Amino acid sequence: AIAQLATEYVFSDFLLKEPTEPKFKGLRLELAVDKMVTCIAVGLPLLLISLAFAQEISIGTQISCFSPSSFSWRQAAFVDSYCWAAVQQKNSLQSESGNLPLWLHKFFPYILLLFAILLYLPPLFWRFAAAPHICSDLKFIMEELDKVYNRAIKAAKSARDFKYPIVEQYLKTKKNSNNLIIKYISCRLLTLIIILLACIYLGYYFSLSSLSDEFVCSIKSGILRNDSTVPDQFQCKLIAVGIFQLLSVINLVVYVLLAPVVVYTLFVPFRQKTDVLKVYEILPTFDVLHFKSEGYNDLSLYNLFLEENISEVKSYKCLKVLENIKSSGQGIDPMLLLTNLGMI
Amino acid sequence: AIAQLATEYVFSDFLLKEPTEPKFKGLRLELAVDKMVTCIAVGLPLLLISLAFAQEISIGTQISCFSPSSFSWRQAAFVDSYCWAAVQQKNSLQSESGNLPLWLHKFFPYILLLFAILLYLPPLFWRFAAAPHICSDLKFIMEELDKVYNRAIKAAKSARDFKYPIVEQYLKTKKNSNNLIIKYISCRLLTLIIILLACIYLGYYFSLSSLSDEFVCSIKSGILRNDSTVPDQFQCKLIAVGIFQLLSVINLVVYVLLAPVVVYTLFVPFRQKTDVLKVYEILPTFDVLHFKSEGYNDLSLYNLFLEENISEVKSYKCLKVLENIKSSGQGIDPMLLLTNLGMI
Amino acid sequence: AIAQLATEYVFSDFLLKEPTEPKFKGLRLELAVDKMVTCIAVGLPLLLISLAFAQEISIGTQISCFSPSSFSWRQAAFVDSYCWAAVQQKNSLQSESGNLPLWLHKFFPYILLLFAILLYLPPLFWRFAAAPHICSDLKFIMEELDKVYNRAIKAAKSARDFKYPIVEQYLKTKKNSNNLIIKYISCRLLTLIIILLACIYLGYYFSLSSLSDEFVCSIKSGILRNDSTVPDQFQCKLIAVGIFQLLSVINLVVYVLLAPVVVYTLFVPFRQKTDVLKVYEILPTFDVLHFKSEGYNDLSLYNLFLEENISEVKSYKCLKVLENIKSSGQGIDPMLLLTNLGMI
Amino acid sequence: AIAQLATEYVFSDFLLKEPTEPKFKGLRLELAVDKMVTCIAVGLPLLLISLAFAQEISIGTQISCFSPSSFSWRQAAFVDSYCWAAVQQKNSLQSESGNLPLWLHKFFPYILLLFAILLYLPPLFWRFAAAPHICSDLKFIMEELDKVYNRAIKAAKSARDFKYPIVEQYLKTKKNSNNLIIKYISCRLLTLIIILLACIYLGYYFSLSSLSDEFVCSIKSGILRNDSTVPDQFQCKLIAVGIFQLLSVINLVVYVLLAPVVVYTLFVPFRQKTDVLKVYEILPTFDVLHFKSEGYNDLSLYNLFLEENISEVKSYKCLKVLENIKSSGQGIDPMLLLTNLGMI
């Protein structure tokens, strides 16, 4: 039913499932905006496919040819099925709009499924190629941040009663390499191109005259070519073409609204803001150097992933509340850190 | 069946599922009133869609055109399907009420699903954008309250046998920022606007003459335009239009009753009452300062979320019972706190 | 529905399920490229089979013979079923394209299923014959790497405050044996041959005239051979043949794009690059000798499997970050290793 | 659907499920070749049964008798059902090929299911009679091997810083008894005989003229015997007989390819090679005596089961890597064993 399709595709965790494995425990591995874009671009065409053939919106068979009254039920069924299979056969049918509109009307669900698959492909390539590496690197970075926070609080407590910046060096090294950012931009660009092509196709499909679904059909090949009792042609109409056009314009609207989001996603350096690591600069055990901005490198992408999935880090949360309290400046950062006692 | 739909949509945890993740363990992340509003506004139109096409209420096909007796079954089926697809084609049909009523009668389930999706969108935006931040902040606040309660009871026990207000400073800082409250008000306002538009549409749909479902249909395009055996027109009726109007007025009543709730929700400062933190003011380790009221800021929203999901805090429950006992004044707050022995 | 099939076969973990057993905990046991190739080559033909007979794309029965009007419904049904069963019987039918096109049109789903099974066979043979051995060997290798890393860090810590290369000897011994690599190459080659044969078949099927689906059928055997009221022949058409050809060309395109991937897979020594063990050469407890390259031996395959599933090793990750930091050369490898404190 | 059947029967763990009980944790209890043979021989005929009546390959009803035009739909249905039930009644029908072909055409699914059940019976008898005993014995043997390995490594460590061969005596005793091997050979031989009988039946079924499915049917018993309006006979055809023959030849090919595998399985002593226990002979605590070869006794079968499910033993894996390293001979077996430190 329509409501069942809605529950499956919008109100359920459709493509929102976290990786089912212990390797990525709590790691999104995909930005929220990218996940939203993929979920829409994939589950919208599927939802429209399901809707267009819902038991309520669908009168019945997808084509009716209006055989003569003399024709029996199965003769008329032969006519309808023959014309359905003959939309491909150009000789059989003669339609003013041509045969491409008939092909599109017959295979619209296939085309929507193709667009959905093509849009799901780049996210899958990301999740299967560049996701494990970033997951491992980000897990190491979070562990290092937790360890340095613990060491700093222990030092502060000892004072009240190595020291090498490994994480900073690793981030600096990531500043050079750009394979991950190149893959990310390539997959986003392919998604954008697929969306644009889908928009072109949907606009063309919705621009039809709405009468191209009606085509003339001739079961006059073979032994029936010279038969007399059979009329030279029939009036066939492809039902649900109006529904297809409505859903196609809906998908076109959604995709044109979505494309600016993908373009904004492509410009990762601009998105790289609100320095996540700036909060850690007040730790004595952490060097006061952010050095993450203004670069078409994997460093900006790692900064984005950190700003996305750093809320799960207790040390980061503690430092964030310390920073927020520092806005008033009533107290002292080391005193607040010592009082917090948030090692684990 | 009707009962199955009821069990799925009203008697089950439809959209009442808690976040399936360890990050939010026991945190609602959504006020009870907001959750009720979203659940109604989403699962009502879906329930009505399912009901309108239930196997019992539905006689059968959604349109019947009453072809002549001479017409065969599949000729009549062609007529019915053609008219179903031609509700869009204005030239084919001539109805007194126009063609918009026919469009609405055909696509009412789609319109209800659209309203449900549009009403579910703002809650989803909230849960995916502003929910993680408030979850982390509120978890930190609850942990700080538990820790300060433990410290105060330990101090009392030591007396019988830092001290910095970090949580108060954090709340004071939240008094300034307003991004969360702005997002909350924006999503509530969008929900209200969607509800009002849905009410307008449902009132228009229910105000129809009830005879607009009957339209005249002409299969007279193409080779059949000059055919003689076919009548110039047919009498088609869109079945289930009365059911659609009944369910639409039901949804209109529900939404007009719900809109005052959304308006009341918009005025969060008025809702900010029954100070949750007032109970903690009797703790020696906690400063006697509430400072949370009369502000279009995130502080009021945090106060609401606390008053919502603070019952899970054992220290808060203990302080609440101490406060309630203090109404009589027979005993002493520190003595009762020491006797409680409710560290964990 | 079409969307359900898509969810099952592309958006779900179809053939992507990890081995359901404690023996292989986190071990892929199959390279990512090989898994992708198998998943495509298997779940594409199945998806096309499901699509070709979807409730929306399918008009109805797969063959209609257009019995005379005098014929009753069940007489026409007998004609259709007889011709469906007589596509095999060459005498009954006379078609210009022959009888092989009719066989193919009738049994296309069977042929796609056969290709899917034949393509799934070599992966299954691998997973049931050569997977347990490589799993055990690789688990031992990872355990040895973890143990040597722990010993090296313990030695470094002791200095700050046996020694036999068992793993290196085992890898060197693997350099000689080649049964695993021979099995891998044989299964890949069989997969490639099956893909090529499938491409040949699909090209032949798509090269048909598109009118071979229309064949002449004669129910004139037995008592009906000399019957007069029955016409000497009927015009039968195999519906969905156009859909079969469309999906067959789609599968042909996918398989021709996939075959280069399989050919590249066959050349494992070229794939053996980015020495995984090179990072471990900086450990005092590990001998400085890689000795893994330029060989049609199981050593290259083991190197590939290591480069695939070594990210799960904490010691390997730590050594990798040490290597990446060494690019700048600011610090010292032993000092960084001591500071890391990543025993477990 | 066809793809669903494929997923259930070839791509899923059909009859590949490990024993669902804690008694056999990780013990196959069935050789890989035997499991493959059983899985094929059982799930192939079931798959063919499901395929032959798939919603796509099946035109409709399994028999059509071509009643006269004067006959009504339910008169024709009576004719078809009567002939379907009268394939057994020899007097009613007169077919050139006889009545056995009609029996076979009607009950082919039953015959395939019978063959599948008969082939599944011997494996079930094994798993319910001789599997628990071998499971217990093999678990004891693995535990003894682990214990002796632990004792030997402990002795080596003590030197660096009872002694009775219970397992060897148990294996020697198993050398005498042969009940398990006799049961194994009997079940394999019964499986082979069932496969041969199935091949005979399938060859006979596929050797039919392909026109035996067409039989003459006479509804002329009872009050209708002397009725005039009813024709003396009808032309009935059993649909799907061609599909049955195709699938039967497929099953015949599979079974003839499989029978050599079963014959090779029967010769267990030849399969008994690559002495698993030879690796343990280098342990000081283990006597240097294999004494397992060249015997129609349970010892060879136990050797096969060990070679199958010994990879799960850490001590065996360690000894195997020690053996492989000994190929070069660079080091010493006791030194390598001491350095390994693989007690558990």
Ligand SMILES: CC(C)CCC[C@@H](C)[C@H]1CC[C@H]2[C@@H]3CC=C4C[C@@H](O)CC[C@]4(C)[C@H]3CC[C@]12C
């Ligand atoms: C997804 C991508 C590939 C879709 C590409 C656009 C498709 C949907 C449409 C939009 C405009 C279309 C073209 C418009 C006009 C003509 C001229 C005609 O004489 C032949 C077909 C041809 C050349 C059409 C082919 C298909 C076409 C290119």
Ligand SMILES: CC(C)CCC[C@@H](C)[C@H]1CC[C@H]2[C@@H]3CC=C4C[C@@H](O)CC[C@]4(C)[C@H]3CC[C@]12C
């Ligand atoms: C992503 C955005 C830009 C998509 C907007 C849809 C655009 C591309 C659509 C809307 C209307 C469409 C046009 C409608 C009609 C025709 C006439 C036909 O003979 C050739 C294609 C052509 C000229 C179409 C080309 C594509 C088109 C311009």
Ligand SMILES: CC(C)CCC[C@@H](C)[C@H]1CC[C@H]2[C@@H]3CC=C4C[C@@H](O)CC[C@]4(C)[C@H]3CC[C@]12C
């Ligand atoms: C969800 C929102 C967009 C719904 C908006 C209201 C819809 C349901 C209805 C209510 C009143 C309607 C209008 C009433 C009268 C007319 C005048 C007529 O000559 C053209 C249509 C037009 C202009 C209608 C368009 C659709 C309309 C605006």
Ligand SMILES: CC(C)CCC[C@@H](C)[C@H]1CC[C@H]2[C@@H]3CC=C4C[C@@H](O)CC[C@]4(C)[C@H]3CC[C@]12C
């Ligand atoms: C949220 C609350 C206010 C909704 C209450 C429903 C109201 C808005 C409904 C109920 C009856 C409706 C009217 C019924 C009939 C017509 C005549 C038509 O030619 C134009 C629209 C118009 C004038 C409708 C406008 C909307 C309407 C006034």
Ligand SMILES: CC(C)CCC[C@@H](C)[C@H]1CC[C@H]2[C@@H]3CC=C4C[C@@H](O)CC[C@]4(C)[C@H]3CC[C@]12C
């Ligand atoms: C999967 C593998 C086995 C498929 C092999 C190719 C199949 C699909 C096709 C492609 C070309 C075909 C051949 C083309 C021409 C002829 C000549 C004709 O007089 C008899 C059939 C015969 C000999 C065909 C047999 C089937 C054939 C070989």
Ligand SMILES: CC(C)CCC[C@@H](C)[C@H]1CC[C@H]2[C@@H]3CC=C4C[C@@H](O)CC[C@]4(C)[C@H]3CC[C@]12C
């Ligand atoms: C893997 C790649 C190479 C596959 C590409 C498809 C090729 C092999 C296909 C496409 C068109 C096909 C041809 C189409 C028509 C005929 C005529 C027929 O009488 C014999 C087979 C023959 C000659 C086919 C042989 C195979 C063929 C050449």
Ligand SMILES: CC(C)CCC[C@@H](C)[C@H]1CC[C@H]2[C@@H]3CC=C4C[C@@H](O)CC[C@]4(C)[C@H]3CC[C@]12C
């Ligand atoms: C599974 C086992 C039992 C199958 C045994 C073979 C079956 C399928 C077939 C193969 C050959 C067949 C026989 C061939 C010829 C005749 C002679 C005829 O006048 C009576 C039936 C009889 C005697 C057939 C009986 C059934 C038969 C034995």
Ligand SMILES: CC(C)CCC[C@@H](C)[C@H]1CC[C@H]2[C@@H]3CC=C4C[C@@H](O)CC[C@]4(C)[C@H]3CC[C@]12C
């Ligand atoms: C396991 C292997 C050997 C099976 C190979 C199938 C063999 C046994 C099949 C293939 C063709 C079959 C023959 C086909 C036709 C007839 C004629 C009939 O009047 C008696 C049975 C008889 C003589 C069949 C006996 C069995 C048969 C020889």
Ligand SMILES: *[C@@H]1O[C@H](CO)[C@@H](O)[C@H](O)[C@H]1NC(C)=O
């Ligand atoms: C049909 O009859 C015409 C008469 O002109 C003839 O040309 C044609 O070949 C016939 N077709 C068939 C299929 O017999």
Ligand SMILES: *[C@@H]1O[C@H](CO)[C@@H](O)[C@H](O)[C@H]1NC(C)=O
């Ligand atoms: C139908 O016949 C009329 C007669 O006036 C003619 O004008 C019209 O073009 C014909 N239509 C078709 C589709 O042939």
Ligand SMILES: *[C@@H]1O[C@H](CO)[C@@H](O)[C@H](O)[C@H]1NC(C)=O
């Ligand atoms: C049909 O009648 C013809 C007349 O020539 C005869 O040859 C043939 O044998 C008959 N067929 C049957 C099945 O009785």
Ligand SMILES: *[C@@H]1O[C@H](CO)[C@@H](O)[C@H](O)[C@H]1NC(C)=O
């Ligand atoms: C049918 O009529 C015949 C006439 O010869 C007679 O012999 C036979 O008994 C009748 N059968 C029945 C069932 O009445």
